[PDB]
Amino acid sequence: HHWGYGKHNGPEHWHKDFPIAKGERQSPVDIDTHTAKYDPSLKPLSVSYDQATSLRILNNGHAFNVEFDDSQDKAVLKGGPLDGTYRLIQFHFHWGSLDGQGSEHTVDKKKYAAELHLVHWNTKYGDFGKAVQQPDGLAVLGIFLKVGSAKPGLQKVVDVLDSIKTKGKSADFTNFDPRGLLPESLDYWTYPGSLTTPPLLECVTWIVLKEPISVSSEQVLKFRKLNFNGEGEPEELMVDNWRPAQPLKNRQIKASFK
Numbered sequence: 131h132h133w134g135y136g137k138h139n140g141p142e143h144w145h146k147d148f149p150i151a152k153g154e155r156q157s158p159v160d161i162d163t164h165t166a167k168y169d170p171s172l173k174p175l176s177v178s179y180d181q182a183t184s185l186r187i188l189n190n191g192h193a194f195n196v197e198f199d200d201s202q203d204k205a206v207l208k209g210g211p212l213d214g215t216y217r218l219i220q221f222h223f224h225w226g227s228l229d230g231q232g233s234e235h236t237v238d239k240k241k242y243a244a245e246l247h248l249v250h251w252n253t254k255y256g257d258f259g260k261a262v263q264q265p266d267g268l269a270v271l272g273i274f275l276k277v278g279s280a281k282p283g284l285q286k287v288v289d290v291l292d293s294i295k296t297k298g299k300s301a302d303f304t305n306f307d308p309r310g311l312l313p314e315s316l317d318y319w320t321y322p323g324s325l326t327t328p329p330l331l332e333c334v335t336w337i338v339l340k341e342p343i344s345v346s347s348e349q350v351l352k353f354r355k356l357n358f359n360g361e362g363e364p365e366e367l368m369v370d371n372w373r374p375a376q377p378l379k380n381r382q383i384k385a386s387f388k
């Protein structure tokens with residue numbers, strides 16, 4: 131009986147195996163645009179994905195991860211609210227069964243069709259594993275997806291999903307450029323949070339971009355053809371793999387823009 135997104139193992143059940151689920155800095159959260167305050171202390175955000183090297187794409191039974199080679203300083207995120215350099219290790223999405231839901235973070239309670247998460251770990255901790263034992267071990271860049279025009283840079287990902295339909299399946303996925311998934315503006319909101327799936331560790335500095343990217347209905351529809359189940363098991367479509375907004379508690383969301 132492992133955790134999942136169903137009625138009997140979903141978000142409302144996670145706290146039993148992972149008590150931190152009711153912690154003080156859980157994610158995602160609703161972003162109240164009117165309460166968010168511009169922060170002058172924020173330095174310019176730097177997203178350097180030019181030397182990014184993807185290696186494989188994997189269906190882990192919860193979502194699909196496009197993994198990168200992080201053995202060297204290539205794709206790095208720095209600046210903004212970040213202290214030091216954070217290295218890109220993988221990215222994935224959260225999406226819904228319908229266009230009206232799917233994102234984890236919400237803006238003034240508005241839910242987007244999906245949300246892209248680019249995961250990075252603080253290089254001063256040596257590795258990914260050590261980083262998740264630190265309050266500032268990770269930095270996740272979140273990008274909302276709305277349904278409209280297709281996102282050309284996403285098609286490569288969409289087309290390989292047929293080869294990793296079920297849990298446990300992986301496929302080579304080299305030379306994918308994550309720069310093709312970024313919106314024009316880097317305006318963002320930031321706050322201290324956690325991983326949004328078990329183990330829900332509170333080691334994340336969240337940077338959520340204000341401008342969403344547009345993806346086509348056809349592209350998101352293919353996301354919904356993936357399976358939560360493994361090969362040879364009853365089919366359960368991989369949809370609504372998002373955690374709802376959690377209590378903001380003692381936190382303030384800062385804006386990078388006036």
Ligand SMILES: C[C@]12CC[C@@H]3c4ccc(OS(N)(=O)=O)cc4CC[C@H]3[C@@H]1CC(=O)N(Cc1cccnc1)C2=O
Nearest residue numbers: 247249258259260262263270324325326327328329330
């Ligand atoms: C694989 C992992 C569990 C899942 C974690 C996880 C879960 C959801 C997730 O999605 S979201 N929305 O970005 O939060 C991202 C990650 C990235 C980190 C990853 C951990 C990376 C890691 O070193 N360890 C080992 C570990 C755990 C605790 C202390 N030291 C090392 C994990 O078990």
Ligand SMILES: [Cl-]
Nearest residue numbers: 135136137366
């Ligand atoms: Cl179900």
Ligand SMILES: [Zn+2]
Nearest residue numbers: 223224247326
């Ligand atoms: Zn995520």
